[PDB]
Symmetry: C2
Subunit: 371 residues, 2 copies
């Protein structure tokens, strides 16, 4: 038996945190459930998709301790729709979970707690406190470049690791999908120096980042070669990592591109977006005809449509033509923090570096395509 | 057209009005296009899906008059992204076979199709213009829209029946929607000129008319024939076929003599219905009605149950009746004041819902087995 009462707001806060992990499509019914575990003065909540597990805790008045599983999204929506201030009773005498508040009564089917997946966290490092805003930045500056593919390939997560440069150790995140790269870094907090490099799955980053919005001043990170764990206070997210070595991305990031050009980032981005409008295609390529003082942008669609726009830029080198996917270019322009962007080109077939003058702790790479 | 300049704001306004009718996909390429016709001091814009046509016009400096067609959504999107205040040149000549759109440092070339292959929407036999208050016309639509069937056939249920009735010596302009499972009626006093054959206005036409009412003025002009309806919103106009067919004698489905009368707090009732309906994913709800109370029950196939008691104003015989939960919530969503009044006969008979604060609306709900 389990039997308790909990304030709607506390119940809603916890269910809200954990239910995000549950895939709407699930042909294994137990993976649609939350594990509820009541003991002492706390109701604990766990949900999983097998690759990761979110846990949270709320205060509750516990008459009889116990554990049961119940449908996650349905439980969340019931509680959401209960009146403000409602005190919520959870109990069992059918074999269903009884949720009772004011004049509403719900009976949900349950599944036994013993069939609920167990996520082991053996051999994690000690907790590493990382400033929340700094961590949010590592993710927001890079996340867009992680592939959206449905595999467990190394490109489908964010490579988190430390490196030694500029007379200190940095905590770095690198994302690449084979078409583009993003890199962001920060001075390594105490305890992060020399963590093993881990590839954190895309969905895990998305969930961590969501939980970061409601976190405090810091989030604790723990890492092992098999597992990564984020603690946000009462909530925690534990995840598998992608197995295998991440590519030697330091060879992909060009160091010696000598054709340097600076431009007004907002004007350029608007010009790119404008010329790209000619095409409705999923991928749209834009030609950059670069010459002293100017970039001429051209997009063509699959039905003889054409758009051209000239943008003045700061450049004095040899003229050349280079092509990029317009979405990848706009993604980079979207991350630039100030009004200028700096591009470093070599030849039309080589990777292009984009640097942000107001932030030396990011690097973006664009891969050219045929123009 | 052949050669003109037009302010971005004037171009965008007109393109935004007309492009909504164009389907995202068209097997006939010219149906994706806007007809541009330049003459005098006006650029005219036309777009169509063959069932209806939207037209509009804007001021322009016309150097060379003429007519051409070009991709609607693309032209709209290009203009949307041009900088504020941009003067926009449109030209078509023997140089390039494409429409040339030029503003500032931007130049676009769009493929065209000839104006002579663009569909023609005839407007022969329309009544003279009837001026209808915009908010009132909006109300007629918003009070009833939800009950139109969402099916793509040319059956009377897939449109809004707009007609004029002599109701006890007073002429009303009335709108009726039903999908065979529920009905909605709204009416207003008939404007001068309305007492017009009854027409079934297609669902999409109502949607487009309603969108255009968002940026209309004080009145909108209505014209009707047995084949066509036309809405005029100043420089913009929407002309549409009607659904050919006899709208049901809906008076036969609206119950007049339902004697079990109950009134409740609409807002609290709707919240209770929404709560119990949560446990499921066309969900029925059971209403166990007795003096002073409705007990709401929803069950699902997965063993899930939700029950809630709501206090109501009723002292008649007890009974149980079932409704589709969404249909019931749709009605409660239209009720204008704090109460709703239900009138029931027996559990297998249609139920009337009236708003005690607006006698110009009627709703009917068909029961389901409980």
């Amino acid at each position: 038996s389990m039997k308790l009462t909990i304030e709607r707001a506390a119940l809603l806060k916890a269910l809200g945190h954990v239910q995000s992990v549950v895939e709407r499509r699930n042909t294994i019914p137990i993976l649609s459930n939350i594990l509820l575990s009541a003991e002492g003065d706390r109701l604990s909540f766990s949900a999983t998709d097998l690759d990761m597990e979110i846990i949270d805790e709320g205060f509750a008045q516990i008459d009889v301790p116990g554990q049961i599983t119940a449908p996650a999204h349905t439980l969340y929506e019931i509680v959401r729709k209960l009146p403000d201030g409602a005190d919520v009773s959870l109990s069992f005498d059918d074999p269903r979970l009884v949720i009772q508040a004011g004049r509403s009564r719900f009976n949900l089917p349950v599944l036994p707690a013993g069939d609920f997946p167990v996520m082991s966290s053996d051999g994690l490092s000690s907790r590493i406190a990382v400033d929340t805003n700094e961590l949010i930045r590592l993710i927001d500056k890079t996340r867009f470049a992680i592939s959206t593919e449905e595999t467990r390939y190394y490109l489908n997560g964010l490579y988190v690791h430390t490196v030694n440069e500029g007379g200190e150790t940095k905590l770095r995140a690198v994302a690449t999908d084979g078409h583009r790269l993003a890199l962001a870094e920060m001075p390594a907090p105490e305890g992060a120096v020399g963590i093993p490099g881990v590839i954190v799955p895309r969905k895990t980053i998305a969930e961590a980042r969501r939980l970061m919005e409601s976190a405090g001043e810091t989030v604790d990170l723990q890492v092992s070669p098999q597992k990564v764990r984020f603690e946000f206070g009462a909530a925690a997210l534990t995840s598998k990592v992608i197995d295998g070595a991440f590519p030697d991305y330091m060879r992909v990031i060009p160091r010696d591109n000598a054709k340097i050009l600076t431009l007004d980032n907002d004007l350029f981005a608007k010009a790119v977006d404008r010329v790209a409008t000619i095409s409705a295609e999923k991928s749209r390529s834009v030609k950059l005809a670069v010459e002293p003082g100017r970039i001429t942008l051209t997009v063509r669609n699959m039905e003889a449509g054409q758009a051209v726009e000239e943008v003045e830029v700061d450049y004095d080198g040899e003229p050349f033509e280079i092509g990029f996917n317009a979405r990848y270019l706009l993604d980079v322009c979207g991350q630039i923090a100030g009004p200028q962007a700096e591009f470093r080109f070599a030849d039309p077939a080589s990777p292009t570096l984009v640097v942000d003058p107001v932030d030396p702790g990011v690097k973006y790479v664009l891969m050219p395509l045929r123009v």
